[PDB]
Amino acid sequence: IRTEKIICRDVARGYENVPIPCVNGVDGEPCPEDYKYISENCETSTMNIDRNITHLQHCTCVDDCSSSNCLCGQLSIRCWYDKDGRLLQEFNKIEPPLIFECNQACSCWRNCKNRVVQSGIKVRLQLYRTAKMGWGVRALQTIPQGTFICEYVGELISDAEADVREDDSYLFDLDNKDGEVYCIDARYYGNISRFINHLCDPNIIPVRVFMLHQDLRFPRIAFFSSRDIRTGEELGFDYGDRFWDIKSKYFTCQCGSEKCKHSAEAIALEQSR
Amino acid sequence: EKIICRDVARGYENVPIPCVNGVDGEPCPEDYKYISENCETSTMNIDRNITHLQHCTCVDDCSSSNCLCGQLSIRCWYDKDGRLLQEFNKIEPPLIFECNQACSCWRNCKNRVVQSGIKVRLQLYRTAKMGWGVRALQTIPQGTFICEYVGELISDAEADVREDDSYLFDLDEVYCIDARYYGNISRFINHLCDPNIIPVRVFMLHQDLRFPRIAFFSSRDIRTGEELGFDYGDRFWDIKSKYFTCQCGSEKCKHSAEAIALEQSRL
Amino acid sequence: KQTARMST
Amino acid sequence: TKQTARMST
Numbered sequence: 036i037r038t039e040k041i042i043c044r045d046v047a048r049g050y051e052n053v054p055i056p057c058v059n060g061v062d063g064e065p066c067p068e069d070y071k072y073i074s075e076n077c078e079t080s081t082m083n084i085d086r087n088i089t090h091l092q093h094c095t096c097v098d099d100c101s102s103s104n105c106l107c108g109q110l111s112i113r114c115w116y117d118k119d120g121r122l123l124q125e126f127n128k129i130e131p132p133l134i135f136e137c138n139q140a141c142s143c144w145r146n147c148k149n150r151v152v153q154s155g156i157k158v159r160l161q162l163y164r165t166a167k168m169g170w171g172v173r174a175l176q177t178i179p180q181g182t183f184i185c186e187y188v189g190e191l192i193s194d195a196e197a198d199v200r201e202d203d204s205y206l207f208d209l210d211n212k213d214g215e216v217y218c219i220d221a222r223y224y225g226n227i228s229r230f231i232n233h234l235c236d237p238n239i240i241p242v243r244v245f246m247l248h249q250d251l252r253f254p255r256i257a258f259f260s261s262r263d264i265r266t267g268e269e270l271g272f273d274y275g276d277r278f279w280d281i282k283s284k285y286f287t288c289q290c291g292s293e294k295c296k297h298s299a300e301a302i303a304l305e306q307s308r
Numbered sequence: 309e310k311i312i313c314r315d316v317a318r319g320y321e322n323v324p325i326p327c328v329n330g331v332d333g334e335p336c337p338e339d340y341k342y343i344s345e346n347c348e349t350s351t352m353n354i355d356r357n358i359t360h361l362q363h364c365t366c367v368d369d370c371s372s373s374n375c376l377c378g379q380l381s382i383r384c385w386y387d388k389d390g391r392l393l394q395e396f397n398k399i400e401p402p403l404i405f406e407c408n409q410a411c412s413c414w415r416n417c418k419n420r421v422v423q424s425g426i427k428v429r430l431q432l433y434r435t436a437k438m439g440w441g442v443r444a445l446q447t448i449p450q451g452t453f454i455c456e457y458v459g460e461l462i463s464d465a466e467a468d469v470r471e472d473d474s475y476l477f478d479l480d481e482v483y484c485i486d487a488r489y490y491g492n493i494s495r496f497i498n499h500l501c502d503p504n505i506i507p508v509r510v511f512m513l514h515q516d517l518r519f520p521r522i523a524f525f526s527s528r529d530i531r532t533g534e535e536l537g538f539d540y541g542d543r544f545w546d547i548k549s550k551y552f553t554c555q556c557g558s559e560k561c562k563h564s565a566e567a568i569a570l571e572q573s574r575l
Numbered sequence: 576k577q578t579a580r581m582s583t
Numbered sequence: 584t585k586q587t588a589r590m591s592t
């Protein structure tokens with residue numbers, strides 16, 4: 036019986052609000068170190084993001100931003116966060132709206148109700164070695180539906196540069212449309228989210244968020260739980276068909292769910308008809 | 309006498325910064341936007357390329373003489389408690405390079421003082437003769453980080469045409485921070501011809517040499533209740549003295565009406 | 576596209 | 584010099 040070993044006390048090296056330990060009870064692979072952990076997106080060529088403070092839409096709330104008059108709320112029809120920072124029950128989890136959080140131009144206080152993602156990771160997570168999907172991330176506590184988990188953080192790159200990246204295991208498109216579109220590549224520079232696996236039965240969903248800038252080319256990708264998550268459960272999202280159409284020629288899904296759509300068996304059945 | 313604001317920073321600093329006025333009837337100043345980090349109102353393209361950062365390979369706490377980020381200022385200037393060393397040149401301070409996201413070290417290394425923000429308890433208060441000022445609500449040892457001069461980043465050419473030139477801080481083709489419309493607690497810090505704090509150029513998350521960040525450290529032990537202040541320098545007083553003169557009240561004052569008048573009697 | 580991309 | 588007043592290190 037191989038022991039479970041704690042192989043890193045904190046993969047984030049103190050950069051997150053909480054430590055993120057790594058364990059391995061499955062094989063001899065040591066703590067992954069072939070990437071630089073960063074807690075906020077980085078750049079490796081000029082992205083010319085619009086950071087002009089006078090361009091920000093902002094609110095005039097003298098409140099905690101919980102009234103229907105908060106402009107930042109209205110830019111997504113309403114503020115989607117409840118009093119504990121969780122997405123409302125009614126939040127559209129199929130096609131999420133763009134969230135505009137409060138920023139430095141707002142009159143409100145830093146602890147207003149519309150600042151969840153910018154406050155960082157609160158839930159306790161663990162990087163661990165899975166049976167069949169390499170590293171994964173799981174919950175060390177129960178997490179209610181609608182809770183902010185973490186952001187997909189990496190190296191911001193253009194569409195064209197993403198097209199010639201050798202390793203395409205960690206590329207996340209910011210926009211599904213044609214033209215001047217950008218991507219996060221977490222291959223060389225990323226946070227805990229780079230270890231989050233695909234599940235055909237997902238428990239987290241990615242949401243586009245704006246915080247300190249509102250350059251629409253560069254939404255930040257925030258993961259929220261899509262249902263109550265039990266202690267010990269592996270986290271995962273649906274990577275989507277723009278991943279699997281390319282990747283399924285090289286490997287197939289090992290998620291093991293009855294609804295799996297990307298296993299060898301699922302793909303084989305569909306080749307038949 | 310009255311607490312007129314519980315926190316002028318509206319929660320944006322590590323600690324609250326209250327405002328009091330025991331002198332006159334002026335309410336809490338609100339003709340500016342409080343921000344805790346520098347802002348831009350025109351395209352600056354600060355170089356944020358992570359591969360341009362000089363960085364260390366330390367897997368200790370960055371207290372050794374081998375830390376590269378230390379060596380970029382000859383040595384790390386911080387001691388184990390986050391204070392500038394005794395020997396730190398307070399007359400002509402070097403540029404400080406803190407550890408950054410490219411360094412192998414942990415976020416709690418010893419070369420990350422400024423980026424950790426305000427730790428001392430400060431108060432915005434009404435002075436007798438220099439309007440608002442900032443003072444200490446605790447003793448502060450020599451070399452302790454106080455706060456950063458935060459504002460709107462602007463070009464030299466734009467700074468030349470700003471109408472209000474009370475809050476312009478030159479960085480060093482020079483850029484400036486204007487804390488008139490956008491600033492933090494530092495915008496309220498007065499000139500003293502007998503100063504107790506000094507401004508230092510610091511680099512943290514980027515190393516774009518056009519845009520050092522201005523950090524204030526105590527230049528001696530400071531007693532509870534003392535007013536904080538620095539020497540604004542002659543690039544301020546050469547222009548400003550035609551409009552007003554220094555009210556600091558020290559015997560060493562070099563910019564009072566009397567001091568300036570005595571010097572005109574260089575005849 | 577030429578590379579695999581995760582996407583919302 | 585310059586048209587406006589500048590604090591400096």
Ligand SMILES: C[S@@+](CC[C@H](N)C(=O)[O-])C[C@H]1O[C@@H](n2cnc3c(N)ncnc32)[C@H](O)[C@@H]1O
Pocket residue numbers: 167168169170171203204205229230231232233234235282286287288289290
């Ligand atoms: C973003 S990474 C996730 C972290 C990865 N497991 C690791 O060890 O670093 C994406 C890669 O992990 C693997 N992976 C993720 N989800 C999977 C699944 N459902 N089935 C098989 N492999 C998966 C594939 O190598 C995929 O390209």
Ligand SMILES: C[S@@+](CC[C@H](N)C(=O)[O-])C[C@H]1O[C@@H](n2cnc3c(N)ncnc32)[C@H](O)[C@@H]1O
Pocket residue numbers: 437438439440441473474475495496497498499500552553554555556
């Ligand atoms: C950076 S501000 C300091 C905050 C200012 N006292 C206030 O109430 O906003 C610079 C301005 O404050 C005043 N001031 C600062 N130091 C002074 C001094 N030693 N003597 C007279 N006025 C001073 C002048 O109006 C100066 O132009």
Ligand SMILES: [Zn+2]
Pocket residue numbers: 094095096099100105106107108137141143
């Ligand atoms: Zn609001």
Ligand SMILES: [Zn+2]
Pocket residue numbers: 093094095100105106107136137138141142143149
């Ligand atoms: Zn707002």
Ligand SMILES: [Zn+2]
Pocket residue numbers: 094096099100137141143144147148149
């Ligand atoms: Zn708000």
Ligand SMILES: [Zn+2]
Pocket residue numbers: 234235236288289290291292294295296297298
């Ligand atoms: Zn599956």
Ligand SMILES: [Zn+2]
Pocket residue numbers: 364365366369370374375376377407411413419
């Ligand atoms: Zn170091």
Ligand SMILES: [Zn+2]
Pocket residue numbers: 364366369370407411413414417418419
């Ligand atoms: Zn360090």
Ligand SMILES: [Zn+2]
Pocket residue numbers: 363364365370375376377406407408411412413419
């Ligand atoms: Zn370093």
Ligand SMILES: [Zn+2]
Pocket residue numbers: 500501502554555556557558560561562563564
């Ligand atoms: Zn004086």
